[PDB]
């Protein structure tokens, strides 16, 4: 791993190859299967022993097909208002309890009633495995197999799904708190494969319409019925191969535009969010800088926790990386030795490049009065030279975003024993014909927020500046509301 796998990525033939032998590599073996099977089978054990008659379904990783090495074991356990969630959380205690005393093995019992879905966190130690057992959760059973038949769809699905998982681990993009669940963004690949000229995949509002004879179920009042087999459905006419398919994606999703749309799988389409049509709709629905519906729950933005700092990553690292895929590094393999098509996507991104995709978060203004500001403050308040969503280069001679303290320190001193922009610009100036640094300053119309990425940085001192411009910029910006 990290060897092995850069090693057999690049000895391997095309790009489709490197994908290919990455789903071969991560995905789990059948020893693996083995042992969560058995342990499956022991908790499954103890549960009947507690309820008679109870089924322990896996879900998630286990059974979506896009199982890589060491990933968590989802466990789903079958058997007024605030009184429910009381009872449910007592009943989610309870099995809390069967984990902890009774089951031989497991340790790491932590009862979360605080989730969307409540959920019971286990170790188990002998098998050195973890994971969460649920209470209620019937949608992830079947959105799960409605994965693994959209694996089976195309032979395609697996690696695009497993290569752009592998990327967003890779640039940051994917996980807990405002980043996107590996689920969430599986469903933007599913989706973008919806989306393309020829369909790579049908609609999920096609698999309902074939559906079959008994193939019929509702879950908390949600249509999840899908044809059981891949055999009933006809082939993709799709003839785009899987480099084509990943470049594709990265332009995508690169030039959508987020925040006014929700992505719909079921009519695998985009559905206006502006104004308020969805979220009348199923009155279920969090709308923000990201908004991607479940396939089966239509109340359900997937992407609801994503922040708009993580969404403009997302799309500045996917225009990066179409760049990328438009080199010849990309498309063509290498002699002897160098790294080529997957590994630079897969490889650890540069804290220059980190710092850059991500952007910066400034005070709400229009978009004309907030970049006259930014161009005003970097040009008067900073000794920027600058030129002409918007976007400006600016040049630095000086080391502007470090020494303010003690200047102002010195002038504050000066003042004693004897209004932002200028103030600020004089403290700059205070401070002192090829450029120190130079860089890019960006302005995207929704929403609106600056992106700084590099341009010449001689002495590597680029991520100071930025760090220094997250702080400073934007309480620039506040100072400059006031004005009016
Ligand atoms: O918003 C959500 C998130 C998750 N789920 C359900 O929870 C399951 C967990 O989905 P995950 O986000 O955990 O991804 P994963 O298990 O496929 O991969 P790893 O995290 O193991 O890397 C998914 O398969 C889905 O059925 C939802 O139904 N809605
Ligand atoms: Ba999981
Ligand atoms: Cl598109």
């Not at 209004?419 to 610009?425: D, K, P, S, V």
């Not at 403290?427 to 119309?445: C, G, I, R, Y």
């Amino acid at each position: 791993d990290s060897h092995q796998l850069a090693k057999a990525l690049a000895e391997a033939a095309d790009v489709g190859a490197q994908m290919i032998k990455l789903v071969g590599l991560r995905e789990l073996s059948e020893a693996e299967r083995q042992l969560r099977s058995l342990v499956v089978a022991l908790m499954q054990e103890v549960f009947t022993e507690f309820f008679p008659g109870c089924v322990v379904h896996p879900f998630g990783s286990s059974i979506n097909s896009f199982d890589v090495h060491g990933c968590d074991l989802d466990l789903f356990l079958d058997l007024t208002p605030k009184e429910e969630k009381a009872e449910g959380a007592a009943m989610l205690e309870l099995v809390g309890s069967i984990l902890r005393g009774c089951v031989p093995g497991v340790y790491r019992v932590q009862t979360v009633p605080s989730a969307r879905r409540p959920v019971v966190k286990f170790a188990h130690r002998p098998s050195g495995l973890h994971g969460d057992v649920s209470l209620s959760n019937r949608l992830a059973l079947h959105n799960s197999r409605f994965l693994s038949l959209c694996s089976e769809l195309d032979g395609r699905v697996r690696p695009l799904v497993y290569t752009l998982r592998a990327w967003a681990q890779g640039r940051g993009l994917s996980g807990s708190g405002p980043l996107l669940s590996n689920y969430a963004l599986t469903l933007l690949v599913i989706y973008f494969l919806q989306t393309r000229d020829p369909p790579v995949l049908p609609t999920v509002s096609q698999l309902t319409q074939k559906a079959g004879e008994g193939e019929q179920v509702e879950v908390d009042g949600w249509d999840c019925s899908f044809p059981r087999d891949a055999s009933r459905l006809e082939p993709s006419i799709n003839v785009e191969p899987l480099s084509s398919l990943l470049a594709q994606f990265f332009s995508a999703v690169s030039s959508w535009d987020l925040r006014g749309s929700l992505l719909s799988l079921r009519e695998g389409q985009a559905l206006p969010v502006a104004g308020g049509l969805p979220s009348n709709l199923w009155e279920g629905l969090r709308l923000g800088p990201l908004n991607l519906q479940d396939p089966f729950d239509l109340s359900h933005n997937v992407a609801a926790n994503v922040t708009s700092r993580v969404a403009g990553r997302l799309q500045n690292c996917c225009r990066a990386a179409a760049n990328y895929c438009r080199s010849l590094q990309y498309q063509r393999r290498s002699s002897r030795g160098r790294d080529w098509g997957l590994l630079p996507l897969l490889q650890p991104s540069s804290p220059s490049s980190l710092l850059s995709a991500t952007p910066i978060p400034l005070p709400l203004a229009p978009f004309t009065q907030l970049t006259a500001a930014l161009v005003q403050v970097f040009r008067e308040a900073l000794g920027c030279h600058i030129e002409q969503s918007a976007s400006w280069r600016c040049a630095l001679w000086h080391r502007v975003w470090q020494g303010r303290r003690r200047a102002r320190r010195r002038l504050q001193q000066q003042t004693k024993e004897g209004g932002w922009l200028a103030t600020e610009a004089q403290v700059t100036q205070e401070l002192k014909t090829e450029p120190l640094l130079s860089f890019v300053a960006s302005v995207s119309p929704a929403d609106r927020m600056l992106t700084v990425t590099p341009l010449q940085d001689p002495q590597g001192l680029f991520p100071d500046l930025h760090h220094f411009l997250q702080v400073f910029l934007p309480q620039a910006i506040r100072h400059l509301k006031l004005e009016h």
